Amino acid sequence: NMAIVDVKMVSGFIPLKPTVKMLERSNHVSRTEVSSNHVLIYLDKVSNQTLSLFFTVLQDVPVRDLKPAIVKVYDYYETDEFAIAEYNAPCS
Numbered sequence: 001n002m003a004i005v006d007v008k009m010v011s012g013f014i015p016l017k018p019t020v021k022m023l024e025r026s027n028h029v030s031r032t033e034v035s036s037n038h039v040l041i042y043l044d045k046v047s048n049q050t051l052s053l054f055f056t057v058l059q060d061v062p063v064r065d066l067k068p069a070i071v072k073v074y075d076y077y078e079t080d081e082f083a084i085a086e087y088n089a090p091c092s
């Protein structure tokens with residue numbers, strides 16, 4: 001069943017509303033799991049689709065040096081390559 005989940009925020013960009021959107025969404029199977037910096041609601045039958053949402057972040061620090069913001073974990077099947085997938089915050 002759907003187990004892997006990892007997404008963090010940009011460096012000092014601290015989250016305020018992500019708690020709200022964590023609490024909000026609940027679709028046919030639910031755990032309300034949350035690890036105090038993350039969000040964990042994935043469990044379901046075999047699912048191959050994706051969905052959409054919107055989340056932004058609160059500002060703790062003025063500056064951002066040019067070093068991109070990709071938080072990538074990747075583990076989906078033993079045989080194929082485990083399939084990294086990246087794109088930077090072009091604000092840099």
Ligand SMILES: *[C@@H]1O[C@H](CO)[C@@H](O)[C@H](O)[C@H]1NC(C)=O
Pocket residue numbers: 046047048049
């Ligand atoms: C998703 O992929 C699997 C691969 O075996 C397939 O069996 C299944 O019919 C597909 N559809 C869903 C959403 O389960």
